[PDB]
RNA sequence: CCGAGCCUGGUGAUAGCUGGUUGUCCAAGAUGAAUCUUAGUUCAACUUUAAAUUUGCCCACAGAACCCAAAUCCCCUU
RNA sequence: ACCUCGGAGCAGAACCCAACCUCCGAGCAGUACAUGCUAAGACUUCACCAGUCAAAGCGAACCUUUGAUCCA
């Protein structure tokens, strides 16, 4: 009487641990939640897969976490915290590894 | 259920594109990005693609 | 050399001596004994066992690969489309310096394929040669050049050098005689008339920015100048070059072969050229 | 397919390849993605633009592949302006 | 010779004589040109602004005023191409941009403008 | 395949330059090819196994495989590894070197 | 020897099924997906050979989630 | 009775893990009509097919599940 349930996993999870090193673009951690929030040079795609916007090295911190006001709930359970208490949460960053230019002699005009 | 509308330009053009709108609504008239002119335009519903 | 005072202390060498070269003989494995026998190779029943096995391309079932992709016009056509063999001037220099290219005299497809400058396949819908720009920046021969497509800047190399080129059509029949004439000549055939381009190609050969050879030449000078201006060059004036005629000389539309007309018959055999006088075939043979 | 032709002995190809995949010379072989004109309207735009793109095979595609057809279409062709010129050969590949 | 229908003097008989086919503004001798095979290779157009008498006077001013970062110190535009393998093209687009040049000669930096007004701004003390 | 005409100035403009008169007093000989070409030629199997071949070798083959060697291990940084195939005359570099051993092959005048 | 005779031929029918598959010696070599598909096959994984060049395994510290254990992953050294 | 897809447990902590296993859900809707075009780099349901994410750039503006090929 039970059908159904088949379905495969998602093969998600972390894609780069921590020290590894991240080419802009290369997806960092795919979730079907929020586990890992977004650092610095950290994107969000639309299904919350976390990639990175600078080329570096992968760091896992934990932050005090304020949400975007507009975020309704989070706001609201914020609100109902007591004085003393501030949610954290763990975040992914890239600390960027090259410069993002050097100036050069082009011609000795 | 909605139907599958072709929305042709009003501008003149060749171009159409396909929007989905439900059945009992009213024919649609649309403003919508005309690239062969480069400017927004209205396109409207010639005829019904499909039904979905 | 030493080899063969080697062969002067060794034994005759007779066909009792021979030894192929080493690694040039593989051995012949055939299923007898422990090791290549019992199964031979082919596993344990099942039809790769019973040689049977589906087909190639086969997935088992599962609609295959090659079929489960969208039919796409990668190929249409193919077959009739034209191709051109190129010809890069740094290729047409090397050949001049080799000496496997007069310069001397008009440089048309049948020089080309007789100094092996290139390799033409009528069969394979080669329409003849088209000259590639690279090289063009060492390219310094003086050459009356005739092909069947060329690059802007191909023709502004070889004009640069004080030459000439011209885009000349030649259809799958022409440009085979012209590829092989010596075959043709042995065909008996009389030299058959050269087709003008399909329609399509029709405004390339009459474009004088092509230097097609149905182009007005009228409108000759006015692009050579341009491309002159354009590539920073002073046109040479080739009329005062002592080999202005050379540079001239142009086959007609319908001539394949420089010297001969077409209805003409080549006897090889004892060195001759009939020509037909019947008023019917020279009209035809001139249109 | 048919390894030896009833008539003249020889190895055929199949056209079904032939009328689906692009050869590259060098020995890339190139096709579009299946359902590029199916039901376009409940695809996302990025799906859209991943199905309407042209794409390589795997080596082992590429075998089978090269193995379905004959050595005509493993020719070199200089066709007047392909597009697939400058794809018809690699350049700077380590290996 | 043989000539059929289709000869160029029947298609053309206005244009019939050899020489009509082969009878003949920047200075390229003013102009000093060099190559660098540097991919791509390199072409330099370099030539004296001010003694370029092929320039009209007006025109060298206004060349001078809006393309003076390419001028050397010896008062010479210089300027290169290097988007082609081929000096040909290479020296083709350097002649093609001394071309542009004339013709305009004859007829980011919004953050540029924010700072300079504000410049202005604190442009206040008199003395 | 006609003898190259004579160019009053060498290299040619397509950079063919016909072997010194008279021929270097090496041990060995690398003899041109009927094209009139230095018969150095790239060589690849197994699509990654790059090799040059210098074939029509008359002579010492022994002798050049030691001139190769000294020239080619400051580029590479190493002895480069090379078959020497006596018999057919041949000398088999691993890697490709075919324009420095032309450039090498006419500096010594073959 | 008739739920459709016998003989010849097509015919060396076909068989994913059963059986068989002949010298010597050495070496490497073991447990997912789809499929009128689970008595089979194709792809993968594994395996063998040859080739290229350069890191591979082990691996401490640091690191990998909220909701509501054994361990694992990752890699400086070694 | 079931056959495809998805969520939870078995499978506690990277990934992955069956069943006549224990439960639940879906074959779309709402929205807008840039919900456009292009493109580095990546993920990937253990193959392929297919499926995802995406900087930069251009252009308007200021979105949250089902199925191939051929054939028409
Ligand atoms: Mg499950
Ligand atoms: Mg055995
Ligand atoms: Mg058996
Ligand atoms: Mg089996
Ligand atoms: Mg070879
Ligand atoms: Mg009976
Ligand atoms: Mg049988
Ligand atoms: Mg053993
Ligand atoms: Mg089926
Ligand atoms: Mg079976
Ligand atoms: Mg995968």
Redesign the pocket.
Known sequence: ???????????????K????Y???????????????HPGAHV?????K?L????EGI?????EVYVPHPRNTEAVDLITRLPKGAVL???F?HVVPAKPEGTFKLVAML | ??ILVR?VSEAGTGFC?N????RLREK?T????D?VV???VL?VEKKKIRS? | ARALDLLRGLPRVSLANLKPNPGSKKPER???????????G?????????????R??????????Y??????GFNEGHSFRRQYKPLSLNRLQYLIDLGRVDPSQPIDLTQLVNGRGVTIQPLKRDYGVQLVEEGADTFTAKVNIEVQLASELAIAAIEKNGGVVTTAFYDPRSLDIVCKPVPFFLRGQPIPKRMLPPEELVPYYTDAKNRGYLADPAKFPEARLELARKYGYILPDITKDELFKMLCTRKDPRQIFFGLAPGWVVNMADKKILKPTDENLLKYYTS | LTYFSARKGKRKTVK?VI??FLRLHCGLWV?????????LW????????????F?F?????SK?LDKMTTSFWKRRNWYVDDPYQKYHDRTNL?? | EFKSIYSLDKLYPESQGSDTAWRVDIPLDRLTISYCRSVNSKAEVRFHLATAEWIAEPVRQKIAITHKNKINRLGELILTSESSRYQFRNLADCLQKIRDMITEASQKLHRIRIENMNRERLRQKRI | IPDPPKHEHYPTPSGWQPPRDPPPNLPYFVRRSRMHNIPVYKDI??????MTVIRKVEGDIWALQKDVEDFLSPLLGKTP?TQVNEVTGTLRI??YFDQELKAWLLEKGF
């Open positions: 009487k039970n059908l159904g349930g088949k379905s495969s996993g998602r093969r998600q999870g972390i894609k641990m921590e020290g590894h991240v080419h802009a673009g290369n997806i960092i951690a795919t979730q079907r939640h929020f586990r890992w994107g969000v795609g639309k299904n897969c990639y990175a916007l600078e992968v760091r896992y911190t934990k954290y949460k763990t992914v | 259920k909605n929305m594109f929007t989905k709108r439900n649609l649309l403003l919508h990005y690239p480069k400017q927004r396109f979905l | 055939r299923p007898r004994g422990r090791r290549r026998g019992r199964k031979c082919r596993g344990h029943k099942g039809e790769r066992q019973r040689g049977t096995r589906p190639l391309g086969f997935e088992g079932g599962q609609t295959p690969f079929i489960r992709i969208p039919k796409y | 079904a009328d689906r096709r579009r993605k299946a359902g590029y004109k199916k039901k409940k695809k996302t735009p990025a799906r859209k633009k991943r199905l309407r793109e794409v095979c795997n080596k082992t595609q089978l380590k290996v | 199997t197994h699509g990654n196994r790059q590894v691993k890697g």
